[PDB]
Design an enzyme around this catalytic site. Structure first.
Site, PDB file in Angstrom:
ATOM      1  N   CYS D 152       0.806  -1.242   0.000  1.00  0.00           N
ATOM      2  CA  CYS D 152       0.000   0.000   0.000  1.00  0.00           C
ATOM      3  C   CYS D 152       0.814   1.254   0.000  1.00  0.00           C
ATOM      4  O   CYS D 152       0.342   2.298  -0.439  1.00  0.00           O
ATOM      5  CB  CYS D 152      -0.947   0.132   1.192  1.00  0.00           C
ATOM      6  SG  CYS D 152      -0.328  -0.538   2.679  1.00  0.00           S
ATOM      7  N   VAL D 156      -0.175   4.367  -2.506  1.00  0.00           N
ATOM      8  CA  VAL D 156      -0.543   5.712  -2.105  1.00  0.00           C
ATOM      9  C   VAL D 156       0.253   6.714  -2.942  1.00  0.00           C
ATOM     10  O   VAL D 156      -0.320   7.614  -3.556  1.00  0.00           O
ATOM     11  CB  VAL D 156      -0.289   5.927  -0.590  1.00  0.00           C
ATOM     12  CG1 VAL D 156      -0.467   7.404  -0.216  1.00  0.00           C
ATOM     13  CG2 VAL D 156      -1.271   5.076   0.210  1.00  0.00           C
TER      14      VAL D 156
HETATM   15  S1  CLF Z   1       5.471  -2.580   6.116  1.00  0.00           S
HETATM   16 FE1  CLF Z   1       4.570  -3.261   8.111  1.00  0.00          FE
HETATM   17  S2  CLF Z   1       3.199  -4.935   7.494  1.00  0.00           S
HETATM   18 FE2  CLF Z   1       3.668  -3.843   5.549  1.00  0.00          FE
HETATM   19  S3  CLF Z   1       1.869  -2.501   5.242  1.00  0.00           S
HETATM   20 FE3  CLF Z   1       3.562  -1.364   6.245  1.00  0.00          FE
HETATM   21  S4  CLF Z   1       3.175  -1.481   8.484  1.00  0.00           S
HETATM   22 FE4  CLF Z   1       1.889  -3.064   7.497  1.00  0.00          FE
HETATM   23 FE5  CLF Z   1      -0.351  -3.916   5.741  1.00  0.00          FE
HETATM   24  S5  CLF Z   1      -2.254  -3.589   4.525  1.00  0.00           S
HETATM   25 FE6  CLF Z   1      -1.255  -5.392   3.499  1.00  0.00          FE
HETATM   26  S6  CLF Z   1       0.421  -5.900   4.989  1.00  0.00           S
HETATM   27 FE7  CLF Z   1       1.496  -4.410   3.638  1.00  0.00          FE
HETATM   28  S7  CLF Z   1       0.016  -4.327   1.892  1.00  0.00           S
HETATM   29 FE8  CLF Z   1      -0.455  -2.676   3.440  1.00  0.00          FE
END
Ligand code: CLF
Ligand SMILES: Nc1ncnc2c1ncn2[C@@H]1O[C@H](COP(=O)(O)OP(=O)(O)O)[C@@H](O)[C@H]1O
Ligand code: CFM
Ligand code: CLF
Ligand code: SF4
Ligand code: ALF
Ligand SMILES: [Ca+2]
Ligand SMILES: [Ca+2]
Ligand SMILES: [Mg+2]
Lengths: 274, 522, 478, 522
Positions: D152, D156
């Site tokens: 994500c 963005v």
């Molecule tokens: S580096 Fe860490 S785990 Fe990654 S997103 Fe960012 S805080 Fe979370 Fe979250 S919703 Fe799915 S897992 Fe990623 S694509 Fe976004």
């Protein structure tokens, strides 16, 4: 070679005694024989083993756990003339089921290959009251090929002889078992020889031989032996030697031709009086 | 009372207050039952070592046996032949029992016939019953063969099956050439498996003994397979699948998988698939014969080696990792076919599952029972998994088998605390799971009563039952499973581990008590 | 429909049997008729089964140990003979009881002598004696022992009564020898008789001289209810609700002490006439206790029975009887309003043992269904006499039907439902015909009384109107 | 303390008295926790209709969701192609979670790569990470293809994937002809199934869009099978088996059954089997394309009909009896192949089991959740079994799907009391199983916590969990099961009836209380 025979007949008619004496004669001729006792009382081998055998298959199997844990050597013993002896065994009178014991005993001999390759004869000595299938075990398919019925001029003995002839038919028609003849073990009745001969002819068989009643048999018996061993020169000893030969050379093997009770009564009246 | 919207069957129903009151008054007024204190006292007593010793001293009383009688096995074996009708010479009460016993396990129809010998037939013999019986069966159910076995009654009185059948033919009750193999199956000798063995040897003798002259070993380039008493449909299927996957020509002798799994399509099929008559007559021409369960195919082996002249391999039942490997390598050596990449991958997948689940299976103590070959296979597999079989019970086992199991147990460090019991029943096993508690027990539905007893002593003493074996009456369609081969090993493994995980989840489900260990990921 | 077509069907079916069997079987199939008070002019029963025709019948052992004796809670029942009979019949009948299995109750357990070859060849009376000693040690709370003879015991002539008497006197315990050798008789029926006689001969008279039991004018005994799924308990609650006191229940949740107290009751209520008329008739001639048959299958029968029973006592009982009927009226009426519309007009064919073939008909009719065919495994002609009044005209009747016959009858009659045993269940389901086990209730709650009627109705509907019966034929096959 | 002979892990261990006393001192002295009376009071409140109403009025808070984000699906899709390295453009934390999530469900290795976009890459764009990323991956892990998806963070900021990959080639970080299909898979749009759809459509376009000229529909005489997000290896397997059994040429696009089930033979295979590039390129030549889980293959369908010009049949997931029937009848019509006797028998056997078990299943109420297609396939099968689905929840379902399910429900008398819920989570389901208690609930491992909560209110309120779905973390090897076809239906039926019988056994195990109904036969 290798001939299997079954001895049947009226109760106490003398089959266990005649067999052993007939067998002693056979061994004298240099024949190899095994006698299979098929009677609860293990008494079909005393005159040959010179003792009442105690190592009966059924009792031996009861001790070893199962017949499957048993071994020929433990129950098969050699006696006079090198004759081999085995006893089915069974319960004491009035309990258990002796017929099943015989079925089991015979199968064990079959599966342990007791009926060895160089035996000349095997005699199944069966009790007098064949009250079930178990006691017909000797004449099922691939067992005894010839049957000899021992009897006497006594009315009740001839009735038992005809009666047994009836029971043989089921087995003879389904297999290859055949009646080899009637052995008259004389009991001093009147016109005894004519009586047995007439019955034999009616059944379609023959009176193989006429064994005379001789107390020498009893004296030999008392000393736990056959007449052939007890007193070789005895006149009775030669009677058994003649029975042995008649058996060895016998070629008449038929399917019993049972007669009715009325025909039997009519036969007794005709050849029984005087 | 009942609420038409939520009707209650016996279980919820008799818990209603009026029913409780009633049963209470029935008890106290006329049952003259022992006080509850006395009952609990005796119960506790039945769980001690003192009671266990008295228990193991039994010589005449058998309580809750783990075996059936010979004819049951003869019937199952006969169902494995094409259009064959199991025929049991003797009393009809037997056949009624063999059928419903199998109906309940396979939940399928089971066709078996009796010649209903009654009082007067026990006295005069059962030859007429055989003549009219064979004629009636043939005319009514039109089978292509009638396999004859016996009830204890006919065995005690020594009914001559061979002579009755021969006379039935001689007298026109059935055609001379109509196949009527037969076997003496004593209810007082061996167990159901011995029945299977006798029935099979009797069927092989009928089609082969008198016609060996033209036979040549290895001429049809196939391998005969004798399954033995088997009640898992998946076992028949996995064996066919593995051989075909090896491009190996085989002949499964006695194959009931089809009659025991017909489709519900609006038509009832009394007969289906099954080993053909031609296959049995041709069997002697195979390259060799393999016996899937050697410990109860002893008579068959003797016949196959003596008459057919096949060098029957000394192979254990193909259960677990090592015995399945050995089975395949032997089949490959006999047929010349190499073990395919397919099976090599399947083997590797089982090993994968073993490695993925080894930490949960390690050290888990088991009590188990069943038939000789099955039980040994489980023991062997259990050991490879790093489990501890502690009580091994085989009611219809013998000394030699026990000697072989002890050798398999001694060859592994995991068999240090295991004991093998033969001639013992489920009441003996009941004592063992109290005095020397195992984590789980592996056996048939009869073990549910043992789990019931253990829980009564307390939740911490409960020994959960893992349903594997025969018969299984309280669960549905488990007879479709597989216990042979890698496939079977995969199923057994999944069942053991998840049973373990299930119990773990149950013990830690208590909130703010034991749930601290109620992990989402296991 | 029309006896003309039914009689033709019977003849057509018999065409496959060899002459001998044909002639015999013909006497066991008939077309019912409401007026014949004597069924021996229509059907013969209680005869030997023809060999090789795959009948559904059991043996005398099942009849003795399986139905009559095994139910008794606090007694140890020994299946004397080869392992087998006992194993197949272990917990196969759902005769429910309350108890602590293994200590004071033993219904669900299988005790046996496990006869081996040496036991047959050398006799097992000594083994039986030793077996009794082991039972007394491991199960001290048992209140009595019975020894149920299996086939071999009858042939070899073991002297079980002697062992029973001797050990009985030594241990001060009731030991009942039962000569129920499988091969005796022709069905489970003679086993009932042998069983009843053993009760009479070894148990029933125990308290003939005792008068410490405090009886009342309302003491009754329910005999012939084996508490299948709790049938007896749901029957018992009704009897006690109308003021009666059940001193005993014969063999369902029954104990040996209540059997011994039966001779003190004022009336014996018999549900299963076939299996218990024997002891009922004996208690009348010896103790002067009258007996009457009743039927608690469905509301019409249950209400009819409660009133006939109540009539045997005074007004207070009859008043309570009407109170009991008023209480349940809303309940069973609600059951019919919901299930009758789903079952109305559906036709059923039954084949059971010796009582239900006739007894459950009313309950079916209470749901608007019609019993087009019925039959028994081992009923006598006094059973068939009672059957002709219950069945509709031109309906089919079969005694000890064969597999072939039953199948062929079902194919032509094409009933909407079949009620029989476990040996028939899977054949008919394959044919796509809804089937309900009428022996074990297919493991479902009780069917007796008012509470059972609701479960009975729910079960019949659940199975008959299930959606699977429409899927039998693959879409790609017209 | 510990006894070296009987070591205790956390569960038995912390129940020891000394640990208990210690945990008690910790609580009273420094935790300042609410009185137990207060806790019990609030717990009871959370099980009421009043609380449920508040619960269902949530607009911003989500508790215990039943869905994941897009890239998780993209990764599973990619793994279905031969020697393909899933590549997620974005932050590494994402990949760590995707890999361990799949590790725990399949208990197998899952290879996925990240270009590790950190703080400055977020600010300056991630074009360099892509360039160095694609080159390091290709050199280090030697894949034949790299399927790129997004985190994500990268969505963005609008990182242009196509542009970044094009320049990666243009500047020589990776050969111009090395296949690098891609897809935008935003976390904040849809769920994991959406990502599967986007990744597939991305790979299909990459090998098909620019070469439609020489394509002819039906020229290769095959049928394409698009499986969609699938986590039961058995489902891939049964579909292959059924078509081959029909002698129907087919091409399964995206087949991970081999990489998720490699053998343990001492060698680690990062890549195994998979859909070949040739198979994708030749895909437009198939007779037609069948979508196994249409409700989440919306984008793929649009592309397949618009570009391949295939007339995708309107089929429901082949689950249960009717839908498997329809699926086979459609394949038969498209391929011209008749449905074989083999399959007709299999269907008859499913029906046999259904009739053999119908009395235990009738009227049983079920609460259930999962993905759209799966959930709908289950509802249908349950109805066919005469069961009552009462709470049907699909967190990632939509209005159209709901409507369709409500239609299936009205077509059956058994759907009378069923309610479908979309956009709701497991905390919502929890309230439903308290206020309108079902007999069992069918879902993934997260449901275990709901069973724990229900049991806390009382044994009589406990709703047991039957595990079917994704992810399953607390049982082993269930991912080898099958839910599709007659085989899957047989497996699901077996699991349902035996769960019912297990619970019944548990409830009637109380001696002299409820054991009067502890029957040996069921
Ligand atoms: S580096 Fe860490 S785990 Fe990654 S997103 Fe960012 S805080 Fe979370 Fe979250 S919703 Fe799915 S897992 Fe990623 S694509 Fe976004
Ligand atoms: N030829 C004979 N002469 C005198 N006594 C004989 C003769 N044959 C047999 N016996 C006697 O009859 C008795 C019983 O015969 P036995 O051999 O036991 O026959 P079975 O086997 O039919 O009982 C023997 O003790 C013996 O004294
Ligand atoms: S088949 Fe009853 S005479 Fe007897 S076990 Fe069933 S229809 Fe019996 S009612 Fe009974 S509880 Fe019975 S259902 Fe008479 S006891 S030998 Mo099989
Ligand atoms: S008619 Fe009835 S059930 Fe049959 S034997 Fe006789 S009492 Fe018993 Fe028993 S052990 Fe097995 S099942 Fe038979 S062969 Fe013997
Ligand atoms: S007559 Fe024969 S089968 Fe019968 S009990 Fe006696 S010895 Fe046994
Ligand atoms: F009395 Al017998 F042979 F010894 F007839
Ligand atoms: Ca079935
Ligand atoms: Ca793995
Ligand atoms: Mg003699």
């Amino acid at each position: 070679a290798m001939r299997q025979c079954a001895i049947y007949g009226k109760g106490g008619i003398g089959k266990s005694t005649t067999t052993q004496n007939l067998v002693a004669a056979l061994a004298e001729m240099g024949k190899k024989v095994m006698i299979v006792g098929c009677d609860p009382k293990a008494d079909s081998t005393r005159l040959i083993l010179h003792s009442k055998a105690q190592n009966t298959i059924m009792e031996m199997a009861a001790e070893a756990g199962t017949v499957e844990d048993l071994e020929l050597e433990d129950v098969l013993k050699a006696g006079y003339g090198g004759v081999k002896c085995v006893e089915s065994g069974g319960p004491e009178p009035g309990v258990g089921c002796a017929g099943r014991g015989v079925i089991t005993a015979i199968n064990f001999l079959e599966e342990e290959g007791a009926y060895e390759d160089d035996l000349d004869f095997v005699f199944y000595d069966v009790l007098g009251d064949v009250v079930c299938g178990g006691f017909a075990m000797p004449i099922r398919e691939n067992k005894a090929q010839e049957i000899y019925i021992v009897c006497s001029g006594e009315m009740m003995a001839m009735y038992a002889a005809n009666n047994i002839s009836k029971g043989i038919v089921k087995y003879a028609n389904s297999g290859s078992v055949r009646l080899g003849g009637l052995i008259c073990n004389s009991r001093n009745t009147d016109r005894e020889d004519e009586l047995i001969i007439a019955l034999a002819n009616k059944l379609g068989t023959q009176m193989i031989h006429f064994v005379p009643r001789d107390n020498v048999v009893q004296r030999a018996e008392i000393r736990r032996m056959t007449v052939i061993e007890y007193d070789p020169k005895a006149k009775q000893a030669d009677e058994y030697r003649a029975l042995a030969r008649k058996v060895v050379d016998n070629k008449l093997l038929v399917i019993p031709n049972p007669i009715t009770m009325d025909e039997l009564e009519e036969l007794l009246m005709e050849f029984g009086i005087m | 009372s009942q609420q038409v919207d939520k009707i209650k069957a016996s279980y919820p129903l008799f818990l209603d207050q009026d029913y409780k009151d009633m049963l209470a008054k029935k008890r106290d007024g006329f049952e003259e039952k022992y006080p509850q204190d006395k009952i609990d006292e005796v119960f506790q007593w039945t769980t001690t070592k003192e009671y266990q010793e008295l228990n193991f001293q039994r010589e005449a009383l058998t309580v809750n046996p783990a075996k059936a009688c010979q004819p049951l096995g003869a019937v199952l074996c006969a169902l494995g032949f094409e259009k064959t009708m199991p025929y049991v010479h003797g009393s009809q009460g037997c056949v009624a029992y063999f059928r419903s016993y199998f109906n309940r396990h396979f939940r399928e129809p089971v066709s078996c016939v009796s010649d209903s010998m009654t009082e007067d037939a026990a006295v005069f013999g059962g030859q007429q019953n055989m003549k009219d019986g064979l004629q009636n069966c043939k005319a009514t159910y039109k089978p292509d063969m009638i396999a004859v076995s016996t009830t204890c009654m006919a065995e005690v009185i020594g009914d001559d099956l061979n002579a009755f059948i021969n006379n039935s033919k001689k007298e026109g009750f059935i055609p001379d050439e109509f196949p009527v193999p037969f076997a003496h199956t004593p209810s007082f000798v061996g167990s159901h498996v011995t029945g299977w063995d006798n029935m099979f040897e009797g069927i092989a003798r009928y089609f082969t003994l008198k016609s060996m002259d033209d036979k040549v070993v290895g001429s049809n380039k196939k391998i005969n397979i004798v399954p033995g008493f088997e009640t898992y449909l998946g076992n028949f299927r996995v064996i066919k699948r593995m051989l075909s996957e090896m491009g190996v020509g085989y002949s499964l002798l006695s194959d009931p998988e089809e009659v025991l799994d017909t489709p519900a399509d609006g038509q009832f099929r009394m007969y289906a698939g099954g080993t053909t008559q031609e296959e049995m007559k041709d069997a002697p021409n195979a390259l060799n014969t393999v016996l899937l369960q050697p410990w109860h195919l002893e008579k068959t082996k003797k016949f196959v080696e003596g008459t057919w002249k096949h060098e029957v391999p000394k192979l254990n039942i193909p259960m677990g990792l090592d015995w399945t490997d050995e089975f395949l390598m032997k089949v490959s050596e006999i047929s010349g076919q190499p073990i395919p990449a397919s099976l090599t991958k399947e083997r590797g997948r089982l090993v994968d599952m073993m490695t993925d689940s080894h930490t949960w299976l390690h050290g888990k103590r088991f009590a188990l029972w069943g038939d000789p070959d099955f039980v040994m296979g489980l023991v062997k597999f259990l050991l490879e998994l790093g489990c501890e079989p502690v009580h091994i019970l085989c009611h219809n086992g013998n000394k030699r088998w026990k000697k072989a199991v002890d050798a398999i147990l001694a060859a592994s460090p995991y068999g240090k605390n295991a004991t093998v019991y033969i001639g013992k029943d489920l009441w003996h096993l009941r004592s063992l799971v109290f005095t020397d508690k195992p984590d789980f027990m592996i056996g048939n539905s009869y073990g549910k009563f043992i789990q019931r007893d253990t829980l009564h002593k307390g939740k911490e003493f409960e020994v959960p039952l893992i349903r594997i074996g025969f018969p299984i009456f309280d669960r549905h369609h488990l007879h479709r499973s597989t216990t042979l081969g890698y496939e079977g090993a995969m199923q057994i493994l999944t069942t053991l581990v998840n049973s373990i995980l299930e119990r773990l989840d149950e013990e830690t489900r208590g909130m703010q008590a034991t749930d601290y260990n109620h992990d989402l990921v296991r | 429909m029309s006896r003309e077509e039914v009689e033709s069907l019977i003849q057509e079916v018999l065409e496959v049997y060899p002459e001998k069997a044909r002639k015999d079987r013909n006497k066991h199939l008939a077309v019912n008729d409401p007026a014949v008070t004597q069924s021996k002019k229509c059907i013969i029963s209680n005869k030997k089964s023809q060999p090789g025709l795959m009948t559904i019948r059991g043996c005398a052992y099942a009849g003795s140990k399986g139905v009559v004796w095994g139910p008794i809670k606090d007694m140890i029942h020994i299946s004397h003979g080869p392992v087998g009979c006992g194993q197949y019949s272990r917990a196969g009948r759902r005769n429910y009881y309350i108890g602590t299995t293994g200590v004071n109750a033993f219904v669900t357990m299988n005790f046996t002598s496990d006869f081996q070859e040496k036991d047959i060849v050398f006799g097992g009376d000594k083994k039986l004696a030793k077996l009794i000693d082991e039972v007394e040690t491991l199960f001290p709370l048992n209140k009595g022992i019975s020894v149920q003879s299996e086939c071999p015991i009858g042939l070899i002539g073991d002297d079980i009564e002697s062992v029973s008497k001797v050990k009985g006197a030594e241990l001060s315990k009731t030991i009942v020898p039962v000569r129920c050798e499988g091969f005796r008789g022709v069905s489970q029926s003679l086993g009932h008789h042998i069983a009843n006689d053993a009760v009479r001969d070894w148990v029933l008279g125990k308290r003939d001289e005792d008068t410490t039991f405090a009886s009342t004018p309302y003491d009754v005994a329910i005999i012939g209810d084996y508490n299948i799924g709790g049938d007896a308990w749901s029957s018992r609650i009704l009897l006690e609700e109308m003021g009666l006191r059940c001193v005993a229940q014969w063999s369902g949740d029954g104990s040996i002490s209540e059997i011994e107290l039966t001779p003190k009751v004022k009336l014996n209520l018999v549900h299963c006439y076939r299996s218990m008329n024997y002891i009922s008739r004996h208690m009348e001639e010896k103790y002067g206790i009258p007996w009457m048959e009743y039927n608690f299958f469905g509301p019409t029968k249950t209400i009819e029975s409660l009133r006939a029973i109540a009539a045997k006592f005074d007004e207070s009982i009859q008043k309570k009887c009407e109170e009991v009927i008023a209480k349940y009226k809303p309940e069973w009426e609600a059951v019919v309003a919901k299930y009758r519309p789903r079952l109305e007009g559906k036709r059923v064919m039954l084949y059971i043992g010796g009582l239900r073939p006739r007894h459950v008909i009313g309950a079916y009719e209470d749901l608007g269904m019609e019993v087009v065919g019925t039959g028994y495994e081992f009923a006598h002609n006094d059973d068939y006499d009672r059957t002709m009044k219950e069945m509709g005209d031109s309906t089919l009747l079969y005694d000890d039907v064969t597999g072939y016959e039953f199948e062929e009858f079902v194919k032509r009659i094409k009933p909407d439902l079949i009620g029989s045993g476990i040996k028939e269940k899977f054949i008919f389901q394959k044919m796509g015909i809804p089937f309900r086990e009428m022996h074990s209730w297919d493991y479902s709650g009780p069917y007796h009384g008012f509470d059972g009627f609701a479960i009975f109705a729910r079960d019949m509907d659940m199975t008959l109107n299930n959606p699977c019966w429409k899927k039998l034929q693959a879409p790609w096959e017209a």
